[PDB]
Every structure is written in C-alpha cells, then in structure tokens.
Design an enzyme around this catalytic site. Structure first.
Site, PDB file in Angstrom:
ATOM      1  N   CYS A   1      78.105   8.204 -26.742  1.00 44.77           N
ATOM      2  CA  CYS A   1      77.280   7.165 -27.342  1.00 44.77           C
ATOM      3  C   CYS A   1      78.065   6.227 -28.272  1.00 44.77           C
ATOM      4  O   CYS A   1      77.611   5.119 -28.562  1.00 44.77           O
ATOM      5  CB  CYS A   1      76.101   7.794 -28.088  1.00 44.77           C
TER       6      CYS A   1
ATOM      7  N   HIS B   1      73.151   4.306 -36.278  1.00 46.52           N
ATOM      8  CA  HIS B   1      73.029   4.610 -34.866  1.00 46.52           C
ATOM      9  C   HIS B   1      71.543   4.711 -34.569  1.00 46.52           C
ATOM     10  O   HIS B   1      71.062   4.157 -33.581  1.00 46.52           O
ATOM     11  CB  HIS B   1      73.737   5.922 -34.532  1.00 46.52           C
TER      12      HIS B   1
ATOM     13  N   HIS C   1      68.288   2.890 -26.476  1.00 46.99           N
ATOM     14  CA  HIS C   1      69.645   3.404 -26.602  1.00 46.99           C
ATOM     15  C   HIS C   1      70.422   3.329 -25.291  1.00 46.99           C
ATOM     16  O   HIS C   1      70.151   4.074 -24.348  1.00 46.99           O
ATOM     17  CB  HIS C   1      69.642   4.841 -27.129  1.00 46.99           C
TER      18      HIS C   1
END
Lengths: 48, 145, 193, 48, 48, 434, 193
Positions: free
Chosen positions: F133, F285, F326
């Site tokens: 990620c 994040h 995401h």
C-alpha cells in the site's frame, strides 16, 4: 387474508409493517470532539 | 384567503439564457512573512515537485480536487468529466461543435450540468461494480471443481 | 472561557422524546434539553441521512458537558417497534467484544417522556378519512402501551424513579371549531389522568 | 561451521524484547520510538 | 461598448478564445450578410 | 479427472472505480497499445502525459538542459500488471488464445518501461518500488534519493494498481476489506462506506487507478523555468519489527521524529526556517480499517509530542480514502497530489464521511479530525504538509512536503524577482498548452 | 470453452452451490430442491457454457533448478512458515540468514550500534510471489480451497516483509525495485542511495 383485508382496508396492513431493528441504532456521546471543531470555527470566522 | 393566495399564482416574465464556462485555472497567493538568507541553501541538494497527475474514480487531479474540496463540480468540472466519461464528442461535420456521444445530439456548455452531471455522479466515484469483464464477483464468479 | 471551563459543572436528565423532527416544538425542546446537560433519546420517522445530518447539526450546537444524544429509526404506529425499542432502552448498557462486535442494549431509566409524535395528513395511498381512526391508536392506545412498556421495565428492573410523561394536550377543547383535529382528540387525556 | 552442521542458523524469534514485561513494555512502546539513544544491553542477552 | 462588456468580464483580457468558440466565429463568417472583409482561416476553402 | 464449471456468490459488490466511459483512446492512445498492454499500463501512461502537461510537453525538451542518462523513472506498484497476470494463468490452463508478451507485460516495471519507450525516451535510471500500500511514498523516497547523488537530475515518481476479480477475493478472504452485505444492513450507501477514524469504521474500500509526480533538482526547475508545486523536505520508508500477532500494526514510522531538534523531521523543517508547529496538515493513510486508523493516529500524535509540538496545536488531518477509496499502489501519490493542492490553494479538505469521531482517539490531543472544509483564503496562509502511508508487511512511509515560496527566499531579491518573471510566463504558456 | 448442444444429465449438489449455478446460466440451467434430502439437482440445458479438460505439449523441457532435495525445513524454517508463504519467500528468507552469517548473526546486534530506523531493506523482484499469484487465479476460478492471505503474499514486497517480521525486526526503510531482469543491480543502486 382477503376477508381480513376487506374489513381493515388497504393502507392498514401496509403501514403496520415492521420497521425497527436493533442493529441500525446510532449513538452520539462525544461532546469532546464536537466542541473542539466548534471553537476553531468560531475563532477563524470571528467578525462581530 | 391564504390557500387562495397560494392557489392564485401568476407569472412574472423571466427571460434568461444561462451558460457555464470559465477562464484557465489561476493561482491565489498566500501571505507569508519570511526572514531568510539567499546563498546558504544548495539548489542541487533540494528536491522540488515540478508537476503531477492522477487517474482515479473521480477523474483527473483537477476534477478529483474539486470533488474533495468543494463537493460539487464547477463549469470546467462537469465539462471535463463529461469529456472523460465520453458523454461529449467533437465533430468537424457541419454545425461544427460539441456533440453528445450517446444520442448524437449537439450540446452547448451550459446544459452539460443539467443533461449529464446527474448521470455523471452515479457513474463516477464510488458505485456498484460495472462489469467490463463479463464477471461479477458479488453476484456470480465462475467456479470449477 | 478557559477559566470558566475549569470550574464548569453539570446536571443530568434522562429523557425519551418522539416527534423531535425539524422545524417543530420538540426540536426546540430537544436542543434545550441538551442545553440543560441531559441525556436524550431522539426518535425519527425518516431514517434518511438528511434527517440524520440535522440532529448532528442540532447536537454539535446545543450540547453541554455530560450531554449524550441518541438518534434512532422509530415508528410509533408499530406495537412491535414500541416493544422492541424499550426492550433496547431498558436492557444493559454494555458492549461485548468477542470475535465479533455485539452492543448490548443500553439501559437508561427515563426521567421525562415526550410523546410529541405527530402524524400528518398525507393521503397518497388513498388512506383519507380512515386516519383519525388509526391515529387514535397512535396518539393514545399506543402511547398507553408505551407508558405501560416503560412501566414494566421500571418495575422489572425495580426502580422507584417516577417517569414524568408530559401529555401534549390540545388547548382548550370546545371553544374552537376550526382546528378539526387537536380539539377533540386530546380531551380524553382527562380520562387518561 | 556451527550453523551448517546443527541446523542452527535459522531461529524464528518470539520477540522477547518487545513484550518482555506485559504491563510496562506496552506503555514503554511509545517511549522507545520517541527517544533516540534507547537501545539493547548485551549482558541480559539483548534486552529492550 | 467594448469597454462596458469586458469591464464586467475582466478575465476576457487574460485568456484564450475557447476552442469551441473558434468554429462558431468561422461559422458566423459563412452566414454573414455581407461577406467578411478578411481571411479568418487558412484551409481548403481559402480560394473562396 | 474432470473439471466441472460452477459458481460463487461474494461479499464485495462495490468498489471505487474510474468513471464509466473512460477510454485511453479518447486521450489519444493508439489501439495497438491498448491491445498489447495491460489495463494498469493505460493508467500510468496517460497519467505521465498529464503529469508532464503541468510544466512542459515534449519529453525531449528535458534533453536540452540535461544529458538523457540523467533522466530517472521511479515508479511503484503493490502488484501491477494484474490483468496480464490473471490473463496468463487462466489462459494457459484454459488453452485459450492469449498474448505471447504476457510475462513481459506482467513485470510491474514494464508499465513505465512502456512509457519510456513511447514517450520520454530517457537514457537514465529506472527503479520500480514495491511498497504494498505504501509504494507511492516509497517511490518518492527513491526519486528523491536518485537526484541528490547526481545519478539523475530529473525523476518521475509515482505508483499505480488495478482492481480486478481476484484482487477483491484476496482482500475479502484476508478479512481486511469491508463487507458490503454488512454495510447495507447498517443502512450505509456506497459513497458513505469509507470512513476514516470513525467509530464505525469497518475496513477499507478497494480501488483502482494510478498517479505520478515529476520530481526535479531545484536548480534545474529554475533554469528550465517550470512551475514549482512544492518542496519535498524529506521522504522515508520505515519497517516495524518482530512480532507474531496479525492485528498488531507497524509503528516504525516514528523513527523520523527521533532526536527532537536533531530529528530528521525537525531539521528538514529548520533548514527552511520552519518550526515543528508549522506543520498544519498531515495526510493520513487512513485506511478506514480498525487496525490502521487508531495506530496511525497514535503514531502521528507521538511524533508531534516528542518534537515539542506546542500543546493543543493539533495537526489537521485529511482522509482522501473516504473519497477516492484505497488504491494499493497509487495510494500515497493521490495523497501526494492532494497535499500539493493543499499547499498552493491553502484549502484543507474535509472528511465528509465522518459521522462521529472514534472515542478512543480522544487520547490524542495533537490530532484534529475535520468533518467540514476549512478553506484558507489569501489572508490565511499555510506552510507544510506530511504524507504518511502504511503498507503490508511493515511497510510504512513519511513524506514531508513544504510550500514552494520557501524556496524562492533563497534566490536573493534580484534573482527572486527574476524567477517570478519566468514562472509567470510559464503559467501563461502552460495554460495555453493545457 | 464449449457450448453444450443437448441437455446434460442431472447431478446432485448443495443448495448453496446450486443457487450459484443459477446465477450464471439462469435461462440455461435448472435447479430443484430434493424434498427428502433438502439438497438440489443441477441440470444444464442446451446453450450452457462448459469448460472441458485438455492438454498441451510444450517446447521447454529443461531449466536451471535448485538441487533436488532442498528443504527450507533442513535450514530450520518452521512448517507454519513454509505453508503460509510462497516458494519465492523461502528463497529470500534463507538467503538473508546466510547473508548475515557472513559477518554477524543476531540481527538485533545491529541495534547496538544503530538506531533501528536506520536499518533498510532494498529487495528487487522481476515478478516475485509467482506461485502465490498462480495459486489465486487457478484456485478462485476453480473454487478449490486456497489460502486467505493470497493477495498479501503475492505482493513482491511481502517476501522481505516476511523476513523483517521473522528476523531483523528493523524499524527502518523498505524498498522493493522491479528491474525485470535487472532488479538485482537496480536494488543495489537504491541500497547505496
């Protein structure tokens, strides 16, 4: 079911349908979070 | 009397033709006080961002930033999204202009919001998965035992 | 304000208010209850986020210390809802974290009860003319079961605390012929007393 | 040569230094990452 | 008249004629009552 | 042995997807390219073009000021080439006709390799991080690294990933993705289900896309006369450590705040004459998972606490994952993009998906979660942002971003005035080209 | 992929699996509850899509392979790790251990001279996690039982992530180049950087 409908009418059975369920509840116990954002909005936007 | 006042209407003449469009993007400077020395910092040792772009659920960096900060598109916002989503096409055939790509209809810049944005919002951003692979994970995903 | 904050005190009130929606008497009561350092159960017929966002706006304005607000989807026309709601209102106040998330029903013994739930005449399904018959269940009979319901919880869980139910009586029955709804329906509140 | 013969060279660590005392080390978790010079003593066999 | 309009829209002074406004002007030259005194575009029709 | 066709019903009915009707063809990509390359390639290819369009167009103009071997490409992926991968393993086992270039096109580096072949044509560095990620911020770190050592004077940093069938089933099986059947049961619409720091946060929404940024030497940017979007004051990736526990999140990103006045975070600021209080915004994040949000909050709370952040001068934090969802590989770049746009416009974007702040987060006083946009006008400036991203397997990262006007202060009044002249002319020519 | 020309003979299936069958075909497939056994019969009509097993002969009969009989277990890797992780992971994990063995052993000895955030991992891949990738795309389409950690284990960075979790425990940088064939030298470049 036709006889029961004949007596009570069309709207009564449809409106009496269940709604509430125990899983959709929402709780707001936070003042601490909402008070902080409330003050900074005043502080920045102060005119009067 | 008051129902009648509500029941008695009238039309005050309103003649209006509105359009939507804008100048190229500008920049609004900020007021910052800085006491600094010039020659001290080596420009060769510094890293600086020249430019950037993105492709995502909300479109390019211009349209995504509009949706994030504002929550609604501007004239250029819907115009760009309708172009990227392929709602509007450009023909050199006579009438020489912007045309709707689906129905083959000429469009101006104003009606872009009215004719499209409702459908744009639905089919952009986050939505139910549209199947371009002839497979739906949530509905039916091919299995072989 | 920082100095006045240090010495700040609080009160406590536990209330259940129905018919709390926007642009109403109860909405002005709700924010004021929140202004009085209370704990308020607020019910909304429409569960849509436009109604949900309103109570968030109302809370973030009028909330004091010790203040906790609760918003729920609710239908006063349903006996099931009434039974299920107060069964939720009266159980535990506990949150169990196992492998999963289970919130045990929050138990707060109601001080004030405000049955301001007010059905309006909108007849799209053709329901017209039968509504005054059905609302008699809602405005009184279902309130009676609502009063009975919170009476059971109070008796079963054994509290001597008196729930104060403010009965939204209509003003001065018999001297107005133009209301058509309020004047007649609320005269049986004298019989309910 | 000690590793090659015995099958020793691979030991999957229990991470003793992380949790060594349940109560304080979880509290000391913050303090460790914050201050620069905090390290392992060798004498206790690599304690945090 | 020019000053009156472009005072209301000062941005007209700093920006480009819109890419969709170019065909419009060239289109207007073709429908004009008395033929245009200049050459708006160099293209296949330049002789005309 | 026979393999007999069957079916399955799955939990995830919703994802954050590029607007319906998108075509690389409309952008002008040739049909031959569209065929031969993976879908993920079309994302990084168009993004690179639009990334250049911010300043210059012709990629060979870089070869006027710079020897071609000084052009670098640092491009991250969590996976990348996903389609081309799933295309081979189906196709081969299925004997279906599939392309011969498959394994070449499944290399996560081949996508920007395609861009270098088609566009820039640089003779210089190519790096391709895997940060799970965190690749995006991890990519920036190495893009920064390539410049300062003189290996390359111009780099392209970024990350990209795609959303396909078996990407979904991997997350949903791993339990990390929010279960749609449960969201609808709670009365949650598709737009409202990604909520960062919220009490009810159920896990992340998976997305698709890609983004890139052009990082350059400060001296070159002035000399070429391009726009300066922001100064990267620092970039770092950080691991965590040995542990058995699966929910236990990596805290190692705190290593940047170590040392106080001697810390990398504060010294980076101090070199611009900027203090620790002068970081207004952190871009979290903010995965909306229950594991990441409070941990990243505790992390940002602590990095501020030890560096002497003035008590109650909280970092105003935006969650872009609540909007864009995401996207694994291109996560921190979308945040990187948003942060530049934050600095120049001054505007701090809201989290509009926040109904209620998690009561656990109260313990963090250096952190503020804003539900409504705070728009900073000309009289209300801002200074420096921070992009933080936590990848899978202890991949954590931090990128300190600082306002462009901090750099213009090092030119002296004569040259400072001379640069504004060039930058102004470029903007006008840039608006033209765009 | 072949289209069935005439209806296939019914086969017994569970209700959950048979309802799934209907979600693909539904005009072309037919499913019924069997009253006694509660299970379902699955009958494919004409027009259904069937995938029928076949074979292929290929050109490459030889490769350069790690010596036969290699085990991560012999090196001392636990069985739990061998299961949960891709084959490529076993390569980088053992190599890292033997790489350290050149100088020091205990990875935390690095934390004596150095603050843990100053330990970096730059590890390249051309693809990496190949097995774990091919395991999902087969397995999912085949509905075979496959691991839940698949997508985590297919991330080319997850392999050294596994090593950092299991061994070094560093708090510092992690980078994972893709250089196709050149990752190794490309990795060194960034490790140097």
């Amino acid at each position: 079911i036709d006889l029961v409908t004949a007596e009570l009418g069309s709207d009564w059975p449809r409106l009496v349908a269940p709604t509430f369920d125990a899983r959709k509840a929402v709780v707001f116990d936070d003042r601490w979070a909402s008070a902080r954002e409330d003050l900074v909005k005043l502080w920045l936007a102060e005119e009067x | 009397e008051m129902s009648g006042a509500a029941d008695x209407x009238x039309x005050x003449x309103x003649x209006x033709x509105x359009x939507x469009x804008x100048x190229x993007x500008x920049x609004x400077x900020x007021x910052x006080x800085x006491x600094x020395x010039x020659x001290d910092v080596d420009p060769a040792d510094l890293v600086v961002i020249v430019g950037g772009a993105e492709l995502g659920p909300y479109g390019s960096s211009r349209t995504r930033f509009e949706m994030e900060v504002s929550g609604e598109l501007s004239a250029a916002g819907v115009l760009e999204l309708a172009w990227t989503t392929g709602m509007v096409k450009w023909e050199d055939d006579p009438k020489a202009g912007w045309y709707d790509t689906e129905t083959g209809e000429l469009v101006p810049e104003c009606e872009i919001v009215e004719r499209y944005h409702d459908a744009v919002v639905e089919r952009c951003g986050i939505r139910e998965f549209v199947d371009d692979g002839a497979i739906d994970p949530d509905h039916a995903s091919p299995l072989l035992v | 304000x920082x100095x006045x904050x240090x010495x700040x005190x609080x009160x406590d009130e536990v209330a259940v208010v129905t018919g709390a929606s926007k642009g109403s008497i109860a909405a002005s009561v709700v924010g004021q209850l929140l202004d009085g350092g209370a704990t308020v159960i607020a019910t909304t017929s429409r569960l849509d986020d436009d109604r949900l966002a309103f109570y968030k706006q109302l809370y973030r304005d009028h909330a004091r210390f010790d203040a906790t607000l609760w918003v729920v989807p609710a239908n006063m026309a349903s006996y099931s809802d009434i039974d299920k709601l107060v069964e939720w209102v009266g159980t535990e106040q506990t949150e169990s974290l196992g492998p999963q998330s289970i919130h045990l029903k929050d138990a707060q013994t109601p001080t004030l009860l405000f049955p301001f739930a007010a059905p309006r005449v909108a007849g799209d399904m053709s329901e017209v003319g039968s509504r005054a018959e059905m609302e008699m269940k809602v405005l009184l009979w279902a309130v009676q079961r609502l009063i009975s319901g919170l009476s059971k919880i109070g008796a079963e869980r054994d509290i001597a605390s008196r729930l104060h139910v403010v009965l939204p009586g209509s003003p001065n029955r018999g001297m107005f012929g133009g209301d058509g709804a309020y004047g007649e329906a609320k005269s049986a509140l004298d019989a309910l007393e | 040569v000690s590793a090659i013969a015995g099958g020793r060279p691979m030991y999957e660590k229990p991470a003793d230094r992380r949790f060594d005392h349940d109560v304080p080390e979880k509290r000391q978790e913050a303090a460790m990452l914050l201050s620069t010079d905090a390290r392992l003593g060798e004498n206790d066999q690599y304690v945090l | 008249a020019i000053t009156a309009l472009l005072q209301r829209y000062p941005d007209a002074e700093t920006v480009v004629l819109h890419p969709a406004d170019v065909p419009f002007f060239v289109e207007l030259c073709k429908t004009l009552g008395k033929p245009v005194n200049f050459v708006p575009v160099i293209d296949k029709d330049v002789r005309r | 042995e026979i393999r007999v066709p069957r079916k399955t019903k799955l939990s995830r009915t919703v994802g954050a997807q590029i607007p319906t009707g998108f075509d690389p063809t409309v952008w002008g990509i040739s049909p031959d390219m569209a065929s031969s390359i993976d879908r993920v390639a079309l994302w990084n290819i168009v993004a690179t073009v639009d990334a250049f369009l911010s300043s210059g167009f012709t990629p060979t103009e870089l070869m006027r000021w710079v020897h071609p071997s000084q052009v670098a490409s640092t491009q991250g992926t969590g996976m990348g080439g996903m389609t081309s991968m799933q295309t081979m393993y189906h196709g081969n086992l299925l004997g279906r006709a599939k392309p011969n270039d498959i394994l070449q096109e499944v290399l996560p580096n081949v996508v920007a390799a395609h861009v270098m072949q088609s566009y820039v044509g640089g003779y210089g560095a190519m790096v391709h991080p895997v940060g799970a990620c965190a690749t995006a911020a991890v990519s920036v770190e190495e893009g920064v690294d390539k410049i300062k050592l003189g290996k390359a004077d111009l780099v392209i940093a970024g990350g990209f990933d795609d959303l396909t069938l078996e990407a979904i089933i991997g997350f949903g099986d791993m339990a990390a993705t929010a279960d749609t059947e449960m969201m609808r049961a709670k009365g949650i619409s598709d737009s409202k289900f990604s909520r960062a720091n919220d009490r009810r946060r159920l896990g992340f929404l998976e997305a698709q896309g890609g983004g890139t940024i052009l990082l350059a030497r400060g001296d070159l940017a002035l000399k070429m006369g391009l726009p300066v979007l922001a100064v990267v004051g620092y970039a770092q990736s950080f691991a965590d450590g040995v542990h058995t526990s699966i929910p236990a999140p990596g805290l190692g990103a705190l290593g940047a705040a170590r040392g106080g006045r001697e810390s990398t975070l504060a010294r980076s600021l101090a070199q611009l004459g900027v203090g620790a209080d002068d970081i207004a915004v952190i871009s979290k994040h903010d995965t909306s998972t229950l594991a990441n949000d409070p941990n990243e909050t505790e992390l940002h709370e602590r990095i501020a606490d030890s560096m002497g952040r003035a008590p109650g001068n909280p970092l105003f934090i935006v969650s872009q994952k609540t909007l864009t969802g995401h996207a694994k590989g291109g996560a921190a770049v979308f945040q990187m993009m948003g942060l530049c746009q934050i600095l120049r416009d001054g505007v701090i974007p809201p989290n509009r998906s926040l109904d209620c702040v998690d009561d656990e987060l109260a313990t963090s006083g250096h952190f503020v979660w804003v539900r409504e946009p705070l728009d900073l006008r000309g009289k209300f400036p801002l200074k420096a942002g921070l992009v933080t991203s936590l990848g899978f397997g202890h991949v954590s990262g931090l990128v300190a971003l600082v306002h462009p006007e901090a750099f213009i202060a090092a030119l002296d009044p004569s040259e400072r005035e001379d640069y504004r002249t060039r930058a102004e002319q470029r903007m006008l020519a840039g608006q033209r080209r765009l | 992929s072949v289209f069935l020309d005439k209806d296939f003979t019914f086969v017994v299936s569970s209700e959950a699996d048979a309802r799934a069958f209907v979600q693909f075909d539904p005009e072309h497939t037919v499913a019924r509850p069997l009253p006694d056994s509660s299970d379902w019969e699955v009958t494919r009509k004409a027009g259904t899509e069937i995938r029928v097993p076949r074979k292929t002969k290929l050109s490459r009969t030889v490769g350069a392979q790690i010596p036969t009989g290699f085990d991560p277990t012999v090196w001392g890797i636990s069985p739990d790790m061998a299961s949960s992780i891709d084959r490529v992971a076993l390569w980088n994990i053992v190599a890292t251990v033997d790489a350290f063995l050149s100088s020091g052993f205990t990875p935390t000895e690095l934390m004596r001279w150095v603050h843990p955030s100053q330990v970096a991992s730059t590890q390249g891949t051309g693809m990496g996690g190949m097995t774990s990738m091919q395991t999902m795309y087969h397995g999912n389409l085949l509905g075979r039982a496959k691991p839940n950690d698949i997508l985590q284990e297919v991330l080319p960075n997850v392999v050294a992530a596994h090593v950092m979790q299991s061994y070094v425990g560093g708090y510092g940088a992690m980078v994972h180049p893709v250089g196709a064939c050149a990752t190794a030298a490309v990795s060194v470049e960034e490790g140097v950087d």
